[PDB]
Amino acid sequence: SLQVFRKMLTPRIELSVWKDDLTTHAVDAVVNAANEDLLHGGGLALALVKAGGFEIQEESKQFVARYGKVSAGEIAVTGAGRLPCKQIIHAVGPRWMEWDKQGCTGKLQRAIVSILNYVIYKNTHIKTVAIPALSSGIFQFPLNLCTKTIVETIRVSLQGKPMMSNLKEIHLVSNEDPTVAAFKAASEFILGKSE
Numbered sequence: 001s002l003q004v005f006r007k008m009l010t011p012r013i014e015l016s017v018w019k020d021d022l023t024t025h026a027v028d029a030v031v032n033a034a035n036e037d038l039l040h041g042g043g044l045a046l047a048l049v050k051a052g053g054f055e056i057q058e059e060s061k062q063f064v065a066r067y068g069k070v071s072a073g074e075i076a077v078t079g080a081g082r083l084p085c086k087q088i089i090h091a092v093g094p095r096w097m098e099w100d101k102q103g104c105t106g107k108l109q110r111a112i113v114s115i116l117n118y119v120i121y122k123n124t125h126i127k128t129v130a131i132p133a134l135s136s137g138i139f140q141f142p143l144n145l146c147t148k149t150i151v152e153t154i155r156v157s158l159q160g161k162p163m164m165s166n167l168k169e170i171h172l173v174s175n176e177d178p179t180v181a182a183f184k185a186a187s188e189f190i191l192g193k194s195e
């Protein structure tokens with residue numbers, strides 16, 4: 001695992017960018033890049049189920065059978081099986097559509113806000129969370145726009161906002177060099193140089 005960028009976002013919360021495998025990255029909560037059915041058939045989603053255990057897939061199915069599909073911009077929280085985290089926050093990013101860039105961007109923003117609301121207000125005991133570049137793989141969201149949107153939404157959601165949570169670290173994580181590089185560049189553009 002390798003940390004390529006870090007910066008205090010607020011006096012309490014540090015943002016960092018990592019090259020790592022989310023299946024072995026130890027944090028309190030890992031964010032999955034899910035679809036609306038929580039059918040974990042490819043990408044990060046499949047990797048999490050394969051490493052954490054099929055129970056993650058069962059809990060996901062039961063969630064949707066009870067509460068309905070998870071719309072883009074929304075979350076569902078499950079257990080994490082054998083993974084080195086306490087929960088999986090399944091976040092549904094938009095599928096990229098060239099004809100609706102503005103709507104897609106908004107859905108990605110909303111997904112980040114939903115993650116942050118869970119961590120800050122619903123489970124105030126989360127100290128660390130790791131977040132992927134939602135929608136930028138299988139969902140084809142352009143990588144630079146994706147990473148910039150994520151970092152800016154995190155910034156604007158937290159800077160100058162009193163809260164009551166134990167959150168100390170947000171990790172932006174990929175196992176692919178170009179995505180790590182895009183997160184690093186977005187972080188530097190929005191927050192300044194690593195410190």
Ligand SMILES: Nc1ncnc2c1ncn2[C@@H]1O[C@H](COP(=O)(O)OP(=O)(O)OC[C@H]2O[C@H](O)[C@H](O)[C@@H]2O)[C@@H](O)[C@H]1O
Pocket residue numbers: 020021022023033034035039040041042043044045046047093132133134135136137138139140141173174175176179
């Ligand atoms: N093990 C991993 N560790 C770290 N980063 C990872 C890992 N696996 C993937 N990534 C990064 O994870 C990021 C997101 O990649 P994607 O998983 O394609 O998600 P999406 O939101 O675009 O597509 C969701 C759909 O794909 C699935 O079929 C779901 O079931 C949905 O149908 C990329 O930056 C990858 O580098």
